[PDB]
Design a protein around this motif. Structure first.
Motif, short mmCIF file in Angstrom:
data_model
loop_
_atom_site.label_atom_id
_atom_site.label_comp_id
_atom_site.label_asym_id
_atom_site.label_seq_id
_atom_site.Cartn_x
_atom_site.Cartn_y
_atom_site.Cartn_z
N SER A 124 6.03 7.46 -4.16
CA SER A 124 5.58 6.49 -3.23
C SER A 124 5.49 6.88 -1.79
CB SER A 124 6.22 5.11 -3.54
OG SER A 124 7.55 4.98 -2.99
N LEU A 125 4.61 6.00 -0.81
CA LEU A 125 4.61 6.18 0.32
C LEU A 125 5.71 6.30 1.41
CD1 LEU A 125 2.25 7.12 2.47
CD2 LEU A 125 1.95 4.74 2.45
N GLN A 159 10.81 1.66 0.14
CA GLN A 159 10.01 0.83 0.46
C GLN A 159 10.06 0.40 2.08
OE1 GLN A 159 7.62 -2.80 1.33
NE2 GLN A 159 9.90 -3.00 0.77
N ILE A 184 7.98 1.36 4.96
CA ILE A 184 6.45 0.82 4.96
C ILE A 184 6.45 -0.72 5.13
CG2 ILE A 184 5.49 2.98 4.06
CD1 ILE A 184 4.79 1.40 1.63
N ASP A 219 0.11 8.63 -1.05
CA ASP A 219 0.67 7.61 -1.71
C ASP A 219 0.61 7.77 -3.29
OD1 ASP A 219 2.26 4.94 -2.06
OD2 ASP A 219 0.23 3.77 -1.80
N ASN A 220 1.89 7.66 -3.89
CA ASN A 220 1.95 8.09 -4.89
C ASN A 220 1.50 9.56 -5.60
OD1 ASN A 220 3.19 5.78 -5.94
ND2 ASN A 220 1.27 4.68 -5.55
N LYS A 275 -1.21 7.73 4.03
CA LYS A 275 -2.19 7.22 2.79
C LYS A 275 -3.47 7.66 2.83
CE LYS A 275 -3.33 2.96 1.03
NZ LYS A 275 -3.07 1.45 0.83
N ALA A 306 2.71 6.14 8.46
CA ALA A 306 2.33 5.70 7.07
C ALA A 306 0.95 5.63 6.71
CB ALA A 306 2.91 4.54 7.09
#
Ligand SMILES: [Cl-]
Ligand SMILES: [Cl-]
Ligand SMILES: [Cl-]
Length: 129
Positions: free
Chosen positions: A24-25, A121, A124, A18-19, A13, A9
């Motif tokens: 989203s990650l 989510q 992460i 990320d996004n 990032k 992750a």
């Protein structure tokens, strides 16, 4: 290299996923888990004779050259073996071109079937990011 969940992750990032195009990650971590079990060296051959490479299982019919997929394109301009590196840069950069192509993350079958519409989510949670 076999990444840990939070280690990957963080790597993703840092490399601007990320996004990226609104994903989203946790979508990217979930896709990597079910495509390769977080192993940069993963390969899988397809029925058509193409092969999928690396942590995001990028396919040689379109995206990289492996010297054995006749009639294929190399849209990421890279040997497929670059995608097996412990450094995820090449994979990430090629993934950005794939996700920009029109079908978003639906290009990744495992994402569509195992991640899409789930609580991504969770992938992460607990990480220092
Ligand atoms: Cl997320
Ligand atoms: Cl190719
Ligand atoms: Cl999209």
């Amino acid at each position: 290299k076999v990444f840990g969940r939070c280690e990957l992750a963080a790597a993703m990032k840092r490399h601007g996923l990320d996004n990226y195009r609104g994903y989203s990650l946790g979508n990217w971590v979930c896709a990597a888990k079910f495509e390769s079990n977080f192993n940069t060296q993963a390969t899988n051959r397809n029925t058509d004779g193409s092969t999928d490479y690396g942590i995001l299982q990028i396919n040689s019919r379109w995206w990289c050259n492996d010297g054995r997929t006749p009639g294929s394109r190399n849209l990421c301009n890279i040997p497929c073996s670059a995608l097996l590196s412990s450094d995820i840069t090449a994979s990430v950069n090629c993934a950005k071109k794939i996700v920009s192509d029109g079908n978003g993350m639906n290009a990744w079958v495992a994402w569509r079937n195992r991640c899409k519409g789930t609580d991504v989510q969770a992938w992460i949670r607990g990480c220092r990011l």
